Amino acid sequence: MVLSEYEWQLVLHVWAKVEADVAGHGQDILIRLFKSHPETLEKFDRFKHLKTEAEMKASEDLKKVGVTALTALGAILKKKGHHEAELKPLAQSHATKHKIPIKYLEFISEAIIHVLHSRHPGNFGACAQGAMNKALELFRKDIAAKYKELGYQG
Ligand code: HEM
C-alpha cells in the first residue's frame, strides 16, 4: 500500500499537535494501551508492576518510555513510507529483545488513534482518521516484513 501526499499531509498535520507535549500524549497512549490490553504491560519488565492508571501516571521513567516511542514514531511518519532505515533496528529490538507480537502494534495503533480522537477532534476528523489508520497500517506491515527477515512470525 501507499499513501498520497494528501494523506501524508493529514497524518503529519495532526502529528504536529502531539509535539506540543509528547510526554503527555505518550502517557495517555501507554495508559490506554495497558488498560485496554493488560497483557501488553507484561512486556515492560521495568514497569509491569504499575498495574493501574494512577500508578502509571506517577512514573517519570514510564513517561520517558512514552516519549522515546512517540519521538521515533514521529520520525518514521515524517519519512512518508520511505522509512526503511528507521525500521531495521526498531524491528530487531522489538522482535528479538522486547518480543512484541505484531498484534501488540495493532493495539498501540488503536490507542494512538483513540488518544488523537480524544484530544484533537479539530484536526482528526474523518479524512485524517482514515489517513492515520493507513499510515500506522503501513508501519505495521513494514515492521512485519522485517520481523520475517529476522525469522519471527510476529
Ligand atoms: C509505534 C510503535 C512503537 C515504537 C515507535 C516504539 C519505539 C521504541 C523505541 C525507539 C525504543 C527504544 C529503543 C529500542 O529498544 O528499540 C523502545 C523500547 C521498548 N519498547 Fe517499543 N515502540 C513501539 C511499540 C511498542 C509496544 C506496542 C510495546 C509493548 C507492548 C513495546 C515495548 C517496548 C519495550 C518493553 C521497550 C524497552 C522499554 C524500556 O527501556 O524499559 N514497544 N520502543
Author numbering: 0 to 153
Q: Can you provide the manuscript's text about this entry?
A:
For this study, a sperm whale myoglobin variant Mb(H64V,V68A) with high activity and stereoselectivity for olefin cyclopropanation reactions via non-native carbene transferase activity59−63 was used as the model enzyme. The high stereoselectivity of this carbene transferase is dependent upon the configuration of the two mutated residues in the distal heme pocket, which enable the precise control of styrene attack to the heme–carbene reactive intermediate during catalysis. Using a myoglobin-based cyclopropanase as a model enzyme, our studies show that covalent stapling with p-chloroacetamido-phenylalanine (pCaaF) provides higher stapling efficiency and enhanced stability (thermodynamic and kinetic) compared to the other stapled variants and the parent protein. Crystallographic analyses of singly and doubly stapled variants provide key insights into the structural basis for stabilization, which includes both direct interactions of the staples with protein residues and indirect interactions through adjacent residues involved in heme binding.
